[PDB]
Design a protein around this ligand. Sequence first.
Ligand code: FMN
Length: 170
Amino acid sequence: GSFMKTIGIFYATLTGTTVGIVDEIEFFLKKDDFKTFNVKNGVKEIENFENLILVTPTYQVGEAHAAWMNNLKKLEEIDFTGKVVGLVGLGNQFAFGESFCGGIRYLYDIVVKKGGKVVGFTSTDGYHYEETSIIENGKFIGLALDEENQPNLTPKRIGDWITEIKKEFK
Ligand SMILES: Cc1cc2nc3c(=O)[nH]c(=O)nc-3n(C[C@H](O)[C@H](O)[C@H](O)COP(=O)(O)O)c2cc1C
């Protein structure tokens, strides 16, 4: 069309940090159409978008937030063929040296298995990790944010990532 198809932004939060990240994403998409959803209210609307941004903090040794984890079977019922998905994780890379932003792995594996494309892999430069489960092809499988230790890097990390994924968006 004349403009990008609407972007569906789906997030969860326990203590509110992720809300702020979503607000930053929305600001960078100020002039583009988006709709935002908290997956505590379910995931069914993911079916309705071709362009998606899925956001989760990490808990429980590399899991996504419970509202995502509880919906993984419903998520896997969706046909992701033709969808273009960016993944955003929040975590603490120093306190969780083997599970930083691990929650996005659960989302990645479902999107790919159900026919979707994941875009916006990011460099591991400037991050610390002992082991990871969120690398493919030498890159992190999404945007990895650390508001506890690297909050000053978040705005540029998000802005650069949004610019990249928009190039693949429908
Ligand atoms: C009990 C607990 C466990 C956590 N487990 C992880 C983890 O495995 N990996 C990670 O990267 N961050 C982990 N974190 C860090 C949180 O994901 C991070 O603080 C995030 O910004 C919280 O987002 P929220 O305020 O939106 O819930 C953990 C935090 C807490 C309190």
